[PDB]
Amino acid sequence: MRAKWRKKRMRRLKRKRRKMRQRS
Amino acid sequence: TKKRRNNGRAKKGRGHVQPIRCTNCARCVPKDKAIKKFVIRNIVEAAAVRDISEASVFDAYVLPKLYVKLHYCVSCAIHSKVVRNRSREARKDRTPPPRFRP
Amino acid sequence: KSLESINSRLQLVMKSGKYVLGYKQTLKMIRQGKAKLVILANNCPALRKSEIEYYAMLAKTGVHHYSGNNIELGTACGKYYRVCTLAIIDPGDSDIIR
Amino acid sequence: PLAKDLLHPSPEEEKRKHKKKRLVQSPNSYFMDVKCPGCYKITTVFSHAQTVVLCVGCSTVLCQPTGGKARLTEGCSFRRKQH
Amino acid sequence: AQRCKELGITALHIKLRATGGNRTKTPGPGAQSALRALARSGMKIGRIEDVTPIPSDSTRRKGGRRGRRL
Amino acid sequence: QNDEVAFRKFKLITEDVQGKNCLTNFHGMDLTRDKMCSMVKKWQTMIEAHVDVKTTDGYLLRLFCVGFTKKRNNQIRKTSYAQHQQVRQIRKKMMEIMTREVQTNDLKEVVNKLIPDSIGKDIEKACQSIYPLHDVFVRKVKMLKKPKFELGKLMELHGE
Amino acid sequence: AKRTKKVGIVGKYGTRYGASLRKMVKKIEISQHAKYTCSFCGKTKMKRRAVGIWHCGSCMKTVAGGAWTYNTTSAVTVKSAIRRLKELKDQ
Amino acid sequence: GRMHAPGKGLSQSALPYRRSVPTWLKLTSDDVKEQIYKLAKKGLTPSQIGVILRDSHGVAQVRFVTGNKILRILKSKGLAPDLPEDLYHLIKKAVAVRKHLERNRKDKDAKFRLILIESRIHRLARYYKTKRVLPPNWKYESSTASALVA
RNA sequence: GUGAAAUUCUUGGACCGGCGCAAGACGGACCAGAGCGAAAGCAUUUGCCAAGAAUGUUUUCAUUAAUCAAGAACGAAAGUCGGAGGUUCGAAGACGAUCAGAUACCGUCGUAGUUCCGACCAUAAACGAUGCCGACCGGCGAUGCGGCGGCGUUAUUCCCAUGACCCGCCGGGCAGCUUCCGGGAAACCAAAGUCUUUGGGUUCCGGGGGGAGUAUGGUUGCAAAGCUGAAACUUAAAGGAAUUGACGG
Ligand SMILES: [Mg+2]
Ligand SMILES: [Mg+2]
Ligand SMILES: [Mg+2]
Ligand SMILES: [Mg+2]
Ligand SMILES: [Mg+2]
Ligand SMILES: [Mg+2]
Ligand SMILES: [Mg+2]
Ligand SMILES: [Mg+2]
Ligand SMILES: [Zn+2]
Ligand SMILES: [Zn+2]
């Protein structure tokens, strides 16, 4: 991938991870 | 590798140069980077100068000129062949092409 | 240039010339006839300003309307309190020409 | 020139060089006697004076401060002090 | 030209116009042919002037900052 | 005009019509596009001034003047740029010698003296002591307000 | 010592009304209850009496001002504009 | 280079190699001292006193003609300023910038210059407290500095 | 309007031409390998307010300095919050085309935004991919500012001043050309030189490629996110500069 889009994908994944952890 | 010493633009002691829009595709180009052509063309064609002179109500009427400054991004400049790629040694000169007066 | 010049001349009237700060003492000095220049902040009450101007007209002494206020005139005098009216007994520094 | 004589530079380059970059520092300024017309006394004036020099016997200005050198008022004469 | 002649107009001043504004300033391909046809139709020609709208500065031109990608 | 220049245009708005004759009066003037574009050139500084000035008869005019720095005949330097203070002094000078040629006279003798652009000529003459200028003209003037349209004034402008 | 980290004057509202609303009302309450320097007597005794009314304790001068500040930026620009139009109107 | 600017200027004064008094100078040491006393009573800072003396009275160096520097002479007579000249001017500049800034809140350039000026003030004050020119407890307060200058 | 179209607007006068009005943006050409600013950045006129480099100085103080963990100010654009404003452009969205498909490139419309005020955020290929201070080491022609000196031309005036040119010198800058100074893997660099002939002072920072700027902890933020920041495991290369060939819608 383009590095910028890998960065965007990682940011989306990190928001999802934060939401999952906050749900607990 | 660094292709050009000036990085393809005239910005030397500046932080920021305001952008302009390419006359062909309306791309935002830094003003010092864009290719500028100042065309000064007869407002009538050289084929039609005689017809306009004959149809003129005046005798010594000087035909008006048309003064247009055109800005190009390098993409449109290369596609329109105003500029061409050059050899590694030939890139270094800045002398404009001759006007070919004769 | 006028404001900074008058501020510097006021600073040199302080520490080198005899002055007096305040309304009551200014009136007392004027009616003793030894006040040579009276400075009024633009913050001054209009009645007080008019009365001091009348006193100065009687005493044949000059009045300068400082382009500050009582706080800024206190700062120009170098004090940490507001002064609204002040008088100079003798400048010692050519603020008042001989 | 590998064999320039640094010890003994001729006065031409000694003068063209900057005041600090000379072999020994020398100021480019000087003092001048100034004569005001209609007056007898002589005023000693710095060539690069930053203040308006005035005569004490006449209410006339002798020089006006400029960027580099005091411009003498017209009609005034001047000579150097000991080169 | 024939309409002007039948309505009794003989000479014409000329005002050439391009799109102007923030858009292109070069006149289109039809200006030369239109003016040459007017001249060759018998109409007399007087003053000629460009009246293209030139902004002292305009609103943002359309196309985005990356231009018209083609 | 019989033999004047061709790059100067006048507006000449119509106020009154009588019989088969429409009658015009001054509304503004402008230089032509080609003349202005030919005057604008590189390696030189142009000074632009504008002034709102009222005539004696109540016509308010906005005047726009332009000037361009001139290179000397023996000049070797490519560019002829005026410094900012020089440009400011030139602009102030050419504003204050457009005011006084309008304030103290009527619209008729304002128009007849901007017909040869004598205002620009004296502006160029006056500014030579700061920086030489060559292409000095009153680039434009526009009418801002008009005084009530006195028909007698219109008729004396047309006839005698 | 420092008693609150960030709430300051809106610590009296406790946990109620929402953090953003308390933050919004905080600066308004601070300006409401602040003492301004009187422009007539020079003392810092000009405080709000009612909404829009600002009274000075010393010279007993009452001024019509803003709801929460002594003067509003709108009114300041208005005063400057009126002065400019007056000096343009007369000559 | 400059302390707080990216400038590397060289404009200085080139004191001549001849320390001797010129023969055309008729002013004696006491005469120059009296001139300095009169100018100091008039209120001139030592830099201005030197400038006036060099421009008008033709004296090249007060130290060369009298043997003492201008501040030394003023302090010996007992009329040297309470604050040093340069510190006083730095505080004056800081007060002026603060006065401008309290009306122009958007002047972030002025805020940056104010930070530079106050840093210079604190460094110079540290130097003077080290040299015991200033009291050991002397501190520059932005609120109360306005009454010290002008 | 486009490659061609079409969505769309149009006998209700669309487009076009003329005269006005209103609004909000934007300051073309002049505009440059020009200037200023710590950077970000800065271009209509005029006024006010403070600030500043360089220059000139036979002024003053006399080492007051350089770089700097922690801390602090500013910090494009996008984004967030509150209030105004909203012309144009235009994320999202809708539609028409193109296509095998077309959530796109092209076209029409259009929300947030783009504008101003106040408060956040602190990130950019925030670049010279190049720390600051100091010294030395080639030539040349220019350019910007300041100063100095000179044949002359020009502006008025009666002459010098003072401007505009011309010829030089000095200092501080933006740079450029050239060179077997020298360096470098080379591209190239008068600095990226004065380095095995290795030491001027000082700050930050890298240790094969991935995992990974990830997990977790802490901290900042309204949020988006910012700062600090692993390991398991995996891999024999990944990369840089140049040469030849092949290929290029
Ligand atoms: Mg490449
Ligand atoms: Mg940048
Ligand atoms: Mg293409
Ligand atoms: Mg921003
Ligand atoms: Mg908003
Ligand atoms: Mg649109
Ligand atoms: Mg170091
Ligand atoms: Mg590694
Ligand atoms: Zn293009
Ligand atoms: Zn009060």
UniProtKB/Swiss-Prot annotation, chain A:
Region (Disordered): 1-24
Subcellular location, principal: cytoplasm
Single annotated GO MF: mRNA 5'-UTR binding
Cytoplasm is among the record's keywords: yes
GO terms for cellular component: cytoplasm; cytosol; cytosolic large ribosomal subunit; endoplasmic reticulum
Subunit relationships: Component of the small ribosomal subunit.
Protein family per UniProt: Belongs to the eukaryotic ribosomal protein eS32 family.
Function: Component of the small ribosomal subunit. The ribosome is a large ribonucleoprotein complex responsible for the synthesis of proteins in the cell. Interacts with the beta subunit of protein kinase CKII and stimulates phosphorylation of DNA topoisomerase II alpha by CKII.
Note: Initially thought to be part of the large ribosomal subunit. Crystal structures show eS32/eL41 to be a small ribosomal subunit forming a bridge at the interface of the 2 subunits.
Name of the protein in question: Small ribosomal subunit protein eS32
The gene coding this protein: RPL41
Swiss-Prot record, chain E:
Positions of modified residues (Phosphothreonine): 52
Residue numbers carrying Phosphoserine: 58
Localization: Cytoplasm; Nucleus, Nucleolus
Region described as Disordered: spans on this chain: 50-70
Glycyl lysine isopeptide (Lys-Gly) (interchain with G-Cter in SUMO2) cross-link, renumbered residues: 25
Sequence ranges of Basic residues compositional bias: 61-70
Family: Belongs to the universal ribosomal protein uS11 family.
Biological role: Component of the small ribosomal subunit. The ribosome is a large ribonucleoprotein complex responsible for the synthesis of proteins in the cell. Part of the small subunit (SSU) processome, first precursor of the small eukaryotic ribosomal subunit. During the assembly of the SSU processome in the nucleolus, many ribosome biogenesis factors, an RNA chaperone and ribosomal proteins associate with the nascent pre-rRNA and work in concert to generate RNA folding, modifications, rearrangements and cleavage as well as targeted degradation of pre-ribosomal RNA by the RNA exosome.
Subunit and partners: Component of the small ribosomal subunit. Part of the small subunit (SSU) processome, composed of more than 70 proteins and the RNA chaperone small nucleolar RNA (snoRNA) U3.
Name of this chain's protein: Small ribosomal subunit protein uS11
Source organism phylogeny: Eukaryota, Metazoa, Chordata, Craniata, Vertebrata
Gene: RPS14
Shown chain mapped onto the complete sequence: 82 to 151 of 151
Swiss-Prot record, chain F:
Positions of post-translational ADP-ribosyltyrosine modification: 81
GO cellular component, one term: ribonucleoprotein complex
Compartments where located: Cytoplasm; Nucleus; Nucleus, Nucleolus
A molecular function GO annotation: RNA binding
Keywords: Acetylation, ADP-ribosylation, Cytoplasm, Differentiation, Isopeptide bond, Nucleus, Phosphoprotein, Ribonucleoprotein, Ribosomal protein, Ubl conjugation
GO BP terms in the entry: cell differentiation; cytoplasmic translation; negative regulation of apoptotic process; ribosomal small subunit biogenesis; translation; translational initiation
Mod. after translation: ADP-ribosylated at Tyr-81 by PARP1 in presence of HPF1.
Family of this protein: Belongs to the eukaryotic ribosomal protein eS1 family.
Self-association state and partner proteins as the record states: Component of the small ribosomal subunit. Mature ribosomes consist of a small (40S) and a large (60S) subunit. The 40S subunit contains about 33 different proteins and 1 molecule of RNA (18S). The 60S subunit contains about 49 different proteins and 3 molecules of RNA (28S, 5.8S and 5S). Identified in a IGF2BP1-dependent mRNP granule complex containing untranslated mRNAs. Binds with high affinity to IPO4. Interacts with DDIT3. Part of the small subunit (SSU) processome, composed of more than 70 proteins and the RNA chaperone small nucleolar RNA (snoRNA) U3.
Name assigned to this protein: Small ribosomal subunit protein eS1
Organism of derivation: Homo sapiens (Human)
Organism phylogeny: Eukaryota, Metazoa, Chordata, Craniata, Vertebrata
Gene: RPS3A
Portion of the full-length sequence here: 75 to 234 of 264
UniProtKB/Swiss-Prot annotation, chain G:
Main location: cytoplasm
ZnF segments: C4-type: 38-59
UniProt keyword annotations, A-Z: Cytoplasm, Metal-binding, Ribonucleoprotein, Ribosomal protein, Zinc, Zinc-finger
Subcellular location: Cytoplasm
Residues in coiled coil: none
GO CC term, one of those recorded: cytosolic ribosome
GO aspect biological process, one term: translation
Tree of life domain: Eukaryota
Record Pfam families: Ribosomal_L37ae (PF01780)
Residues annotated to bind Zn(2+): 38, 41, 56, 59
Similarity-based family: Belongs to the eukaryotic ribosomal protein eL43 family.
Function: Component of the large ribosomal subunit. The ribosome is a large ribonucleoprotein complex responsible for the synthesis of proteins in the cell.
Self-association and partners: Component of the large ribosomal subunit.
NCBIfam families reported for this sequence: eL43_euk_arch (TIGR00280), PRK03976.1 (NF003058)
HAMAP family to which the protein is assigned, alphabetical: Ribosomal_eL43 (MF_00327)
Name listed for the protein in its UniProt record: Large ribosomal subunit protein eL43
